[PDB]
């Protein structure tokens, strides 16, 4: 298992423009296009992202390319963030993957906001961090996914993803 396989499980793959859990226009493997309620604005962002006139539909290859870019950006975002970088550096490989996942989903800013949780992860207080992470809008809105991430931080293994 690895970060890519992990995110592919959590996000799925759709080749046509769709709305995510929050109602925002998305495509590919969880690639957010816009928060704007306009489909045309969405289509415009898509063309610009792909570099062609798309009609709202992309190929698998295109989806993978956006995915590759998005994961790299997630990582780079963590490392440039004063609050995130130190946590990530303190973590083992599996748990690092869990943090990237959260960043991919909610943005660096969002995650950087889990102050107390970040502190507990840094201190390696797994059970305490898990409880804390659960007290969040994130957990209440996407409980299954949140549960997977939480279990990953708690155990340091890929158990939550094995099977899927
Ligand atoms: Cl892009
Ligand atoms: Cl969910």
Swiss-Prot record:
Pfam families: Phage_lysozyme (PF00959). One of its GO terms (molecular function) is lysozyme activity. Changing residue 11 to A/F/H/M/N: Complete loss of enzymatic activity. The active site is at residues 11, 20. Changing residue 117 to F: 10-fold decrease in enzymatic activity. GO terms for biological process: cell wall macromolecule catabolic process; defense response to bacterium; peptidoglycan catabolic process; viral release from host cell by cytolysis. This is Endolysin. It comes from Enterobacteria phage T4 (Bacteriophage T4).
């Amino acid at each position: 298992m690895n970060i890519f396989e992990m995110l592919r499980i959590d996000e799925g793959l759709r080749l046509k423009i769709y709305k995510d859990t929050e109602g925002y226009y998305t495509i590919g493997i969880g690639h957010l296009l816009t928060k704007s309620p306009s489909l045309n604005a969405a289509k415009s962002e898509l063309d610009k992202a792909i570099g062609r006139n798309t009609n709202g539909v992309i190929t698998k290859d295109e989806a993978e390319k956006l995915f590759n870019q998005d994961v790299d950006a997630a990582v780079r975002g963590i490392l440039r963030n004063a609050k995130l970088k130190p946590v990530y550096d303190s973590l083992d490989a599996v748990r690092r993957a869990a943090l990237i996942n959260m960043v991919f989903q909610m943005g660096e800013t969002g995650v950087a906001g889990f102050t107390n949780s970040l502190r507990m992860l840094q201190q390696k207080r797994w059970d305490e961090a898990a409880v804390n992470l659960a007290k969040s809008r994130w957990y209440n809105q996407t409980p299954n996914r949140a549960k997977r991430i939480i279990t990953t931080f708690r155990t340091g293994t890929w158990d939550a993803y094995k099977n899927l």
